[model samples]
Target: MTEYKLVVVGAGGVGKNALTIQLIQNHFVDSYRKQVVIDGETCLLDILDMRTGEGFLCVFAINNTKSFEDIHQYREQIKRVKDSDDVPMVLVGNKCDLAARTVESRQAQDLARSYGIPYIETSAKTRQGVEDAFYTLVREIRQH
Candidate 1:
């Protein structure tokens, strides 16, 4: 099986969990039924290995406010994943539908560029750019 690390981070209302649920289960929800973890001080990382033909995808929701701080705090963790010879990263910006109320697109783009990582703004509710975002990363990983 191939192993990949998938990490999701964001504020409480940004729909991080919802995105994961929709992607992994193909189900969408109007609201989250469980408690959401902000993880302002700590970074959450997931290592996924699927030996089968199935690929891996990491979904992250960037709430309007915590984008900068969350990225800054976890910069090292992201670098570690990107630096690995075997592991590749696909950084996602969730909740793009709420652009008016949250972090600007330019800010997210700047961060992505700084790290030389692919960036995508996705909305789980609308199913916009969700599959493309995941497939793009998987394709990149497969190429290498």
Candidate 2:
């Protein structure tokens, strides 16, 4: 079986878990918690390698202004994965259904542009843009 690696990173309460659950099990968590640990920091980077002959998907959320700040705080760690020549990245701006209170779409676009990564907006609740986002990334990875 072929294997693929995916990394999901983001601030708390931005629906990172929601996207993960939706992908893995087609469901969402109703009650979520916000936990930020330096050791258990508010921001986390989850790496997954699946051997199902399917390309990996990284689903993440960035809700507050501090999301980028926290990411910058872990720049070294993030850059390592992002800068890797072997692993491709698909940066997603999740929870778009709640766009009014969360980080703007342009901000996510700008960040992705700066990093030369692909970006998309997704909503696990509505199942909007979810399948396309995953398949597009996989298709791109396969094309190269």
Candidate 3:
């Protein structure tokens, strides 16, 4: 089995840590041997802050406009660091449980479409789309 390393990046208060923690704890519930089956292959997954990862989960809070705006920089920096325009990444809008959402779904969808990446909405509090976000990143990593 192979291991997929994923980096989570976002602006401050975007719930990056909370999302990562929720995925780790809720899915694996431990630090050691985080393994899962994806598309008929069993693989280990690691969530990290470092850039040298197979894929990136660029996150922003739906309630915060600045957070959404900053995702552009994160994507560009990732491309610069990786030295590749085509990278495995996902656009994630977090805090979906919040009633006040400044970043509309269509806006995020349009941005992601322009980047040629998939977009997912998640709520770390409700554990919604949390697994799908990470799993989709892994799938993207495998596709290329």
Candidate 4:
């Protein structure tokens, strides 16, 4: 268990700073792919999408179920790649201007809970829970 403070960010999104970025205008990877690899243990991975991803922030959109499911696959990939079942990760349900959502957050929340991670709901339209979500995950990393 080690801390990867320099978060790795990727997701077909606008801002490329880990998973923390602009409001509702974001996108995600379809699946997990290993572009790089190292034995480094990372706890602050802000991904919207992982392997060689340092076990990260799994950002999914509340409106995009495709991304939601993508995070699920990445979650498993993180466990496998990070070589740990309890990797520190935050499941982000972005796109908060959203109310009618079909991509079940319960599933993602359940998965995050299973990993002892926090599941946050954020919206970029008004920049509501973005910071909270970012800090919340960072705080989770600082703890252990």
Which structure among the candidates has the greatest TM-score?
3
TM-score (C-alpha, index-matched) for candidate 4:
0.62
Q: For candidate 2, give the lDDT.
A: 0.53
Error of 4 at 51 (Å): 7.7
lDDT of 1 by residue, 5-79 (tens): 344544455566666676666677831222222223222223232221122333345555665556654555444
- lDDT assessment of candidate 4: 0.55
Clashes of 1: 2
Clashing pairs in 1: 1-51, 64-102
Local distance difference test, each candidate = 0.54, 0.53, 0.89, 0.55
Model 3: per-residue Cα lDDT over 38-116, one tens digit each: 8899999887754488899999999999999999999999999999999999999999999999999999999999999
Query: What residue pairs clash in candidate 3, if any at all?
Result: none
Q: Which stretches of candidate 4 lie over 4 Å from their true place?
A: 1-19, 23-55
Residues forming the 10-long window of minimal summed lDDT in candidate 2: 32-41
Clashes of each: 2, 5, 0, 5
What lDDT tens digits, residue by residue, belong to model 2 across residues 1-144? Answer: 222334455666656666756665666663222222322223322334222122233444545566655544333455454554444556666677765545666876777676566778888877677655655555555555
TM-score of 2: 0.63
lDDT of 4 at 113: 77
